[PDB]
Ligand binder design. Structure first.
Ligand code: HEM
Ligand code: HEM
Lengths: 362, 362
């Protein structure tokens, strides 16, 4: 139920322990007035400080003027902060507005087309994002709803994704969660305690070429549908061969324990772990922070199931792109399809109570 | 920790309300009564395992490598999480298997109600399984595995995820709020009120359908809220709609949430005034619904609402009168009923030898 500190050199919600629930929203900007957009970023920051502390936005949820709408929509009254983090990102499309073209980071690379892609343009892209993670889904929804309300007339929601359950880990001391294929997902990630690895692979540095982004990160979001019907008729051995780990313990093939180090040459050459491992990718390492979803049925008699894949990295060109390219032959591709995509520059942290989201850019 | 599966009644009705919901409606594809009975037996066996936090069949790993695992594995390492599985039979089931004369008269088709906008794809169903648990992955795993066991005999027609409180952070006796920000559940039938359950919830032998004695009748309504319109309404307008204040949830003119309402003091079309038993010839319901938030729609609006579930001894003396009385409800401006289904929920599984539906199939 505790609060995660909002202020810092970095935004919370990245290295932070992974919370149980996600509500991710991509927004498009509808104002061409830079000053109004700045005002919104300031108002949003003020609301975020309230929300992440378990407090109502503005003057509260009730007890104001009877004739006015309440400042806060009220559905989180009486609830704990629930480890809420709110993380903002700017998409490549934002830099076409407000005189920002020259400030677009080179590290904010457009993704190439990948084999097998079937991207829904309506559930892709976005001028900006807000990642709301918390242990209570009502707290997360309340946060996105109230930010959207404050932003009426200046931003609209383009698309959103709820995650019902995490599929990622930044805390190796705690149980690794399973994805809907039934395998632990998150064993070999980057932990929040690994400052050296975070500096090497996740946070942008000044020398990288874009000063305003120092202490920020770059996010890739990929909506991935899972072919559950096909997977569920696969043998146990086929399933384990796809990954290169056993299903029960999640140990590397031939080994006894989950966290024993992989011996890659014992895996099939198309195994997911073998292809995705840093040693197969010139050392490229990601912070994975995704969640599972189910969006009803497919209309054809089956449950829908997928994974909303989130990866943070110091540079898209040296993180997601090389790794995903190396997955072109992945055995897992028979059971998945990427159906949505977006990239964002995640700015540095809000340093103190006088700072605001995006201040280093604007 | 766990809720017992066996009893005179199915669990999931009068047993404590768990934090999360996965509700699935199924259609039957087989015409063979013996094949269907065999499925009900297999489903009951699986339910006994699932409600005790065990994998179905011979497990999720450790079997023949060349066979698919019996359990899909995504709940390994999770706790029972107070999982209950509640099965119900829709009107349409009784058109199969020679059952047409055993449909209960209390399993009435609902009338069309003013303002209904029902999506046929998200309505109806030959069968339902209500999976409730504190961990949504435990609920989803149950539905996914029941659907897998049944494939070839049933398909999933529609599926709904929902949430109430998060018990880890929110005290037991605190009334949850719905997404309009009002306390929801103050005046309900409690699972503790054994006599009131016998009067208003459980079917009795003398009601006319012997196989249903100890069962109940379920109405499900997927009710969208027009969130963005509501959030523009003044505080007074919102309180007037219900007849209770927003902060405390007290009836107008009273001081505390649990003060009995004075109906005369509320506006004539206030929701509480219209829905109260005194306004409906004594008709009283067990409400056991869940909030939902599915994402955002095409126009950028929140697809969110209440997945309304009510249990009652007879649909004709429970939901139908009360919902009819809501024809002039002030709340109608802000909601829309968009899916509907009714089910007869059989009596409990008495012991290890019993099975879901045994009183019907014989
Ligand atoms: C639905 C899609 C996916 C599934 C089910 C999945 C599943 C898994 C599993 C079971 C593991 C082993 C446990 C672990 O170390 O986390 C793993 C590792 C990994 N995955 Fe994926 N994965 C998916 C998509 C991706 C994608 C899109 C990427 C990157 C482009 C990726 C990058 C990795 C990395 C880097 C590792 C760690 C390898 C190592 O260093 O040992 N995964 N995945
Ligand atoms: C989105 C839809 C709905 C919302 C937001 C909602 C909200 C509320 C609220 C805030 C209360 C007052 C607190 C309480 O006693 O629970 C209430 C009471 C009640 N609602 Fe609704 N309601 C909805 C739909 C319905 C429907 C469809 C029915 C029945 C057909 C219904 C039946 C009742 C009943 C019986 C009460 C208790 C009245 C009493 O005895 O005092 N509600 N509802």
């Amino acid at each position: 139920g505790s609060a995660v500190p909002f202020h810092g050199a970095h935004q919370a919600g990245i290295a932070t322990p992974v919370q149980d629930r996600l509500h991710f929203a991509a927004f498009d900007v509808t104002t061409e007035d830079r000053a109004a957009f700045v005002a919104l970023l300031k108002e949003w920051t003020a609301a975020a400080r309230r929300l992440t502390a378990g407090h109502a936005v503005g003057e509260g949820a009730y007890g104001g003027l009877p004739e006015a709408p309440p400042d806060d929509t009220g559905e989180a009254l009486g609830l704990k902060p629930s480890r809420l983090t709110l993380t903002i990102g700017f998409g490549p499309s934002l830099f076409t507005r407000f005189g920002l073209a020259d400030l677009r980071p080179e590290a904010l690379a457009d993704l190439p087309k990948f084999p097998g892609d079937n991207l829904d343009r309506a559930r892709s892209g976005g001028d900006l994002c807000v990642q709301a993670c918390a242990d209570d889904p009502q707290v997360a929804v309340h946060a996105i709803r109230n930010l959207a309300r404050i932003g009426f007339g200046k931003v609209v929601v383009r698309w959103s994704q709820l995650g019902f359950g995490k599929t990622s880990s930044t805390t190796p001391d705690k149980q690794t969660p399973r994805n809907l294929l039934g395998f632990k997902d998150g064993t070999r990630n980057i932990a929040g305690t690994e400052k050296d690895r975070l500096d090497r692979f996740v946070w942008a540095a000044e020398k990288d070429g874009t000063p305003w982004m120092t202490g920020g990160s770059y996010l890739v979001a990929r909506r991935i549908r899972m072919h559950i019907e096909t997977w569920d008729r696969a043998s146990l051995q086929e399933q384990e061969d796809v990954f290169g780990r056993d299903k029960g313990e999640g140990a590397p093939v031939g080994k006894a324990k989950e966290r024993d180090e992989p011996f890659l040459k014992a895996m099939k050459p198309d195994a997911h772990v073998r292809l995705a491992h840093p040693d197969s990718n010139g050392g490229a390492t990601l912070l994975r922070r995704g969640y599972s979803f189910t969006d009803g049925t497919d209309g054809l008699g089956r449950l829908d199931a997928g994974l909303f894949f989130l990866a943070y990295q110091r540079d898209i060109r040296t993180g997601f792109v090389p790794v995903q390219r190396n997955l072109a032959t992945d055995a897992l591709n028979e059971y998945i399809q990427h159906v949505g995509s977006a990239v964002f520059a995640v700015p540095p942290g809000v340093r103190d109570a006088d700072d605001w989201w995006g201040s280093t850019l604007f």
